[PDB]
Amino acid sequence: HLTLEQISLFKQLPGYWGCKDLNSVFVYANQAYGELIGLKRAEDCIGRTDFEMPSPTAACAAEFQQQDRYVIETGHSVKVLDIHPYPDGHWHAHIFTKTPWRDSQGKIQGTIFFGQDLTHWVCRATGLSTLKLTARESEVLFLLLYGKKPQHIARVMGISIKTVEGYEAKLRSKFGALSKDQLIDLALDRGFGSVIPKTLLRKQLSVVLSDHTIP
Amino acid sequence: HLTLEQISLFKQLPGYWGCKDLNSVFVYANQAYGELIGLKRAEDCIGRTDFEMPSPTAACAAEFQQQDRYVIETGHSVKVLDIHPYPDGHWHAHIFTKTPWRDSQGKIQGTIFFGQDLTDTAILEVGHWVCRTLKLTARESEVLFLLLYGKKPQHIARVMGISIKTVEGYEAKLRSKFGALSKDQLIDLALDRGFGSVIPKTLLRKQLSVVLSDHTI
Ligand SMILES: Cc1c[nH]c(=O)c(C)n1
Ligand SMILES: Cc1c[nH]c(=O)c(C)n1
């Protein structure tokens, strides 16, 4: 049994978090998440789905559920880049971690979500050492660097697949790469993975980002 | 008071986290942090300090406690890059965020700590990247990085397992390579060139606790 002292940690652990059941119906949300999502008491999340929150995030409720079902059917954990206008009238950006929620004998009974606010050197063989992209180009590049395929990028940005190939070709040539693989390596070796394009921060989207341990 | 579902969620939330009192005595640690730190029964953390965990991390316990005291005294949140050997026999890198812990009436009674495994998305959150004509060697980039984040020469020596004189050597090699005339101008030029977002890849197997950012809330 937990002391009240330890329960205050439960109440004050920073971030935007909670859990849903197998139908992605909310079971708990901490106060920070409830306020974010437009509610004065986070208890009003319980029993509702992502479609039913008074918040523009509900326009991506179908993406949230597909994410949730992936964690549930596979047991893998995912990292989601979430960028949305919110009931407070501001755009926010988060990485939401999603992991399976397990019961007392270990079986998956839902998902846990945990969100955090998102607030010219070259790599050499050993060490480091020492081109102007379009808004559209830098958006396509950022998504390609995190493992997203062209049909993924077409959906996120709301353009045709052929158009993503258009921007991919410019990038490949702007970096002087002879293939998409070389484009990725060259861009990574120049710090392109560590910056979110500022125009991407005003495009509503929910996309899983490929994630790897370092090293 | 908590329901069975809220207790279950509390026990499965990701990360390696817990809280400490005003003297950084542990009051709670989740299972993930217990296991990482060598205490498979995580309530064994309670009432210990960082000096008393069964873990090579304790060599940096004085630095952990200086970070905790900063959060307590200022009310700021800090993010720390933490690289250490661990009782499982491996090196682990993490970002640890430290937040004031407050009582029923709002005053600070300690700190909350929350660690993430160093991953692609995790470094993105802190705006740094890792490498998988002005040229820097492996050891020079390590020195330069530790210089950018406030480490004194004797601290740098400890991280790199060498002597201060050796460290002075690399520091002068960087001052002439950047054309800077002092350590001040060297930090300024390297920052001006965007070295403030690089973590040299060879630091992932050297022991260090380094504050990356400090935030008002
Ligand atoms: C804002 C947000 C994104 N994805 C989610 O699943 C949840 C619960 N909230
Ligand atoms: C491993 C580790 C790093 N820094 C800390 O303060 C804590 C609580 N643990």
Q: How far apart are CA A31 and CA A42, in angstroms?
A: 5
Residue A126 touches chain B, beta carbons under 8 Å: yes
Point out which residues pair with B78 in neighbouring strands.
B98, B214
Residue B127 touches chain A, beta carbons under 8 Å: yes
Q: Do B186 and B174 meet the contact criterion of CB atoms below 8 Å apart?
A: yes
Q: Residue A121: list chain B partners with CB under 8 A.
A: 193-195, 198
Residues B121 and B147 in one domain: no
Ligand 2 nearest-atom number relative to CA B65: 6
List the 138-177 stretch of B: residues with Cβ below 8 A of A: 138, 140-141
- The verdict on residue B104 lying in a domain is yes
Q: Do B178 and B148 meet the contact criterion of CB atoms below 8 Å apart?
A: no
Residue A1, token pair as written in the block = 């049994």
Q: Which of A9, A99, A215 sits opposite B19 (nearest CB)?
A: A9
Residues B51 and B117 in one domain: yes
Residues B53 and B123 in one domain: yes
Q: Among positive and negative, which fits the CA dihedral B207, B209, B213, B217?
A: positive
Q: How far is CA A22 from CA A59, A66, A108, A110, A155, in A?
A: 20, 12, 8, 4, 26
Point out which residues pair with A21 in neighbouring strands.
A110
Residue B57, token pair as written in the block = 């991390």
> Which residues are near ligand 1 (CB < 6 Å)?
A 50, 57, 64, 82, 96, 113
Q: Do A171 and A183 meet the contact criterion of CB atoms below 8 Å apart?
A: yes
Residues B10 and B84 in one domain: yes
Q: Which of A77, A127, A189 sits opposite B137 (nearest CB)?
A: A127
Q: Residue B85: name the closest of B55, B130, B65, B60 by CA.
A: B55
Nearest CA to ligand 2 atom 1: B57
Q: How far apart are CA A43 and CA A99, in angstroms?
A: 22
- The verdict on residue B35 lying in a domain is yes
For residue A188, report the distance from its CA to the centre of ligand 2, in Å.
30
- The verdict on residue B134 lying in a domain is no
Give residue A110's domain range: 4-117
Q: Among positive and negative, which fits the CA dihedral B124, A88, A98, A155?
A: negative
B107, with CB counted inside 10 A (0-12, 13-18, 19+), is exposed
Strands laid side by side in the B26-29 sheet? B26-29, B16-21, B108-117, B91-102, B77-85, B208-215
Residues B145 and B123 in one domain: no
CATH of the domain at A91: 3.30.450.20
Q: Do B156 and B167 meet the contact criterion of CB atoms below 8 Å apart?
A: yes
Residue A105 touches chain B, beta carbons under 8 Å: no
Residues B121 and B20 in one domain: yes
Residues B14 and B95 in one domain: yes
Please report which helix (H) or strand (E) contains residue A188, including its range.
Answer: helix A180-188
The DSSP annotation for chain B comes to: ---HHHHHHHHH-SSEEEEEETT--EEEE-HHHHHHTT-SSGGGGTT--GGGSSSGGGGGHHHHHHHHHHHHHH--EEEEEEEEE-TTSSEEEEEEEEEEEE-TTS-EEEEEEEEEE-BHHHHHHTT-EE----EE-HHHHHHHHHHHTT--HHHHHHHHTS-HHHHHHHHHHHHHHTT-SSHHHHHHHHHHTTGGGEE-GGGGGS-EEEEEEEE--
Point out which residues pair with A129 in neighbouring strands.
A122, B135
Residues B36 and B90 in one domain: yes
The DSSP annotation for A78-115 comes to: EEEEEEEE-TTSSEEEEEEEEEEEE-TTS-EEEEEEEE
- The verdict on residue B42 lying in a domain is yes
Residues B195 and B172 in one domain: yes
Q: Which of A95, A127, A215 sits opposite B125 (nearest CB)?
A: A95
The separation between CA A45 and the C-alpha centre of its own chain, rounded to angstroms, equals 21
Q: Residue A119: list chain B partners with CB under 8 A.
A: 215
- The verdict on residue B132 lying in a domain is no
Q: Do B84 and B105 meet the contact criterion of CB atoms below 8 Å apart?
A: no
Q: Do B95 and B116 meet the contact criterion of CB atoms below 8 Å apart?
A: yes
- The verdict on residue B77 lying in a domain is yes
- The verdict on residue B162 lying in a domain is yes
Residue A146, token pair as written in the block = 């995190």
Backbone angles phi, psi at A197, to 5 degrees: -55, 130
Q: Which of A114, A121, A126 sits opposite B138 (nearest CB)?
A: A126
Q: How far is CA B171 from CA B143, B157, B207, in A?
A: 7, 12, 20
In terms of phi and psi (left: phi > 0; alpha: psi -120 to 50; beta: otherwise), the region of A24 is left
For residue B64, report the distance from its CA to the centre of ligand 2, in Å.
6
Residues B211 and B186 in one domain: no
List the 12-51 stretch of B: residues with Cβ below 8 A of A: 12-15, 17-19, 27-28
Domain count along chain B: 2
CA distance A15 to chain B (A): 10
Q: How far apart are CA A24 and CA A28, in angstroms?
A: 11
Strands laid side by side in the A122-123 sheet? A122-123, A128-129, B135-136
- The verdict on residue B32 lying in a domain is yes
Nearest CA to ligand 1 atom 5: A64
Q: How far is CA B193 from CA A168, B23, B190, in A?
A: 28, 40, 5
| Measured CA angle at A111 (ends A110, A117), to 5 deg | 160
The size of the A-B interface in CB pairs under 8 A is 143
CATH of the domain at B146: 1.10.10.10
DSSP state of A172: H
C-alpha dihedral (A181, A211, B91, A117), degrees to nearest 10: 130
Provide the 3-class DSSP secondary structure of residue A129.
strand
Radius of gyration of chain A (CA): 20
Q: How far apart are CA B121 and CA A211, in angstroms?
A: 6
Amino acid identity, residue B170?
Y
DSSP state of A51: G
Point out which residues pair with B96 in neighbouring strands.
B80, B115
For residue A150, report the distance from its CA to the centre of ligand 1, in Å.
24
Q: Residue B65: name the closest of B43, B35, B98 by CA.
A: B98
Amino acid identity, residue A187?
A
Residues B20 and B111 in one domain: yes
Residues B191 and B211 in one domain: no
A82, with CB counted inside 10 A (0-12, 13-18, 19+), is buried
- Find tokens 């090699």 and name the residue: B173
Provide the 3-class DSSP secondary structure of residue A17.
strand
Nearest CA to ligand 1 atom 1: A57
